[PDB]
């Protein structure tokens, strides 16, 4: 699977960055696991079967083969490259794909 995410996004004044993360092709799966990693630290992770309930700074919705990610609480020091990881967990085969990363610019 090929994961696509935008090269660069600008966070809002209020520290909220939103961007899509999409995968292709659309293999049969019942459960997709999305992780946001910062370059490696784990920002948030969730399984879709509206997500990221274990992670107050992340939210997201999943349709078709595309997650609309929102990362909030960002400050200027949080500027950096945020990788999207997508897993097609079950039924097998398992598939994993890494995006090339979204550079998020945050201004205080």
């Amino acid at each position, epitope marked *: *699977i*090929q*994961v696509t995410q935008p090269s660069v996004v600008l966070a809002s004044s209020h520290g909220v960055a939103s961007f899509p993360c999409e995968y*292709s092709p659309s293999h049969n799966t019942d*459960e997709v696991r999305v*992780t946001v*990693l910062r370059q*490696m630290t*784990e920002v948030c992770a969730t399984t879709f079967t509206v997500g990221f309930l274990d992670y107050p700074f992340c939210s997201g919705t999943f349709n078709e083969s595309r997650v609309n990610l929102t990362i909030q609480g960002l400050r200027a020091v949080d500027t950096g490259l945020y990788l999207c*990881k997508v897993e097609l*967990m*079950y039924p*097998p*085969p*398992y*598939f*994993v*794909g*890494m995006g090339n990363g979204t550079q998020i610019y945050v201004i205080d």
Partner: antibody
């Protein structure tokens, strides 16, 4: 420091069962996919089985599906391989391996040897 | 299911020379989940490179990787005596996780 320590190997007769254990230390075990990989004498690496983060999803090589079962206990940070209906060709060094978050098998134990012989 | 074929079976070289090891994958998969491992006798495999070109932790700079689609290479720029070993490639983008058959890097005489 990341360490993985396998145990349980030994000599077993064809048809019987053996359970291997892998003790994980030095990382948050529940945040990684874990695997067993084996290497028969003089041969290369063969993935056997892997298990998702919370244990819900188990993946098997065709060669072992139906005979081997993988499980994990995230409270005591241990991975298991339940081997049944063992055969001569299952003789190998059995390694426990962690999947890095970016996908490769970034740490491996030293392995435990399983000999299946009459 | 992804099959990996490594070449040559054996690379024969001297310290200070360059090693180039090839790994060909059955299909392209939209990115490069291609890893390389070193293995010495009696020891477990060690991750060297992942994502085709990223070095793993503590791996010397003389190890590099390149490639995309179906064709990948591991380069040891200037071989050291500690590098004579067997090298495996692996695809980790989908189950079953699969490996190449290995390339032995031996001393040439």
């Amino acid at each position: 420091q990341v360490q993985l320590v396998e145990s349980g190997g030994g000599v077993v007769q064809p048809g019987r069962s053996l359970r291997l254990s892998c003790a994980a230390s030095g990382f948050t075990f529940s945040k990684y996919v874990m695997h067993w990989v084996r290497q028969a004498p003089g041969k290369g690496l063969e993935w056997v089985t892997g298990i998702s983060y919370d244990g819900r999803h188990k993946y098997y090589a065709d060669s072992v599906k139906g005979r081997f079962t993988i499980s994990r206990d995230n409270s005591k940070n241990t991975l298991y391989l339940q081997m049944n209906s063992l055969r001569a060709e299952d003789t190998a060094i059995y390694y426990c391996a962690r999947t890095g978050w970016l996908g490769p098998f970034d740490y491996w134990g030293q392995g435990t040897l399983v000999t299946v012989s009459s | 299911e992804i099959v990996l074929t490594q070449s040559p079976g054996t690379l024969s070289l001297s310290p200070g020379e360059r090693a180039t090891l090839s790994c060909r994958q059955s299909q392209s998969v939209g990115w490069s989940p291609l890893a390389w491992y070193q293995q010495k006798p009696g020891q477990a495999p060690r991750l060297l490179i992942y994502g085709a070109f990223s070095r793993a932790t503590g791996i010397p700079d003389r190890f590099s990787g390149s490639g995309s689609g179906t064709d990948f290479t591991l380069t040891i720029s200037r071989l050291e005596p500690e590098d004579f070993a067997v090298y495996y490639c692996q695809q980790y983008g989908q189950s079953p996780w699969t490996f190449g058959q290995g390339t032995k890097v031996e001393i040439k005489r």
